[PDB]
Amino acid sequence: SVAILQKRDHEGFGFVLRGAPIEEFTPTPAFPALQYLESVDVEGVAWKAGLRTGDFLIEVNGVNVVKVGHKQVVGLIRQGGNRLVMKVVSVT
Fold first, then answer.
1. Residues 6+ away with beta carbon under 8 Å from 61
2. How many domains are there within the chain?
3. What positions does the domain PDZ occupy?
4. Which has fewest Cβ within 10 Å: 5, 36, 67, 80?
5. Hey, is 55 helix, strand or coil?
């Protein structure tokens, strides 16, 4: 799916990112991407946009991140400022 987030300058998006040798990695239908959402504050910015714990990250602001490191994805979220667009799959 796809989520669209808009926040104030002095809040966050209300989610935590986790992920990991990132050259022979291999997507599966159980572990599709390197990065996934560890927690989504309930009734938070990301939540209200329909983001949930367990969502894996395919795209961030137009860039594909299936085999992209962690520091690089967090950099994409930062560059967007108060706007963020992500493509996620829910392994649920």
1. 76, 77, 79, 80, 84, 85, 86
2. 1
3. 2-92
4. 67
5. strand
* CB atoms near residue 21 (< 10 Å): 5
Scanning the structure block, which residue is given the tokens 């959402």? Answer: 37
Using the structure block, give the residue that is written with the tokens 């159980």: 30
Q: Amino acid letter at 64? A: N
CA distance 88 to 52: 10
What is the C-alpha to C-alpha distance for residues 23 and 20, in angstroms, rounded to an integer? Answer: 11
Tokens linked to 31 = 């572990």
Structure tokens at 76: 């994409």
Coil, strand or helix: which one is 87? strand
Q: Give CA–CA dist 29/91, Å, rounded.
A: 8
Query: What's the CATH code of the domain at 80?
Result: 2.30.42.10
* Cβ-based burial of 74 (10 A; exposed 0-12, middle 13-18, buried ≥19): middle
- Pairing relationship of beta strands 55-60 and 63-64 according to DSSP bridges: antiparallel
Q: Judge contact between 36 and 55, C-beta under 8 A.
A: yes
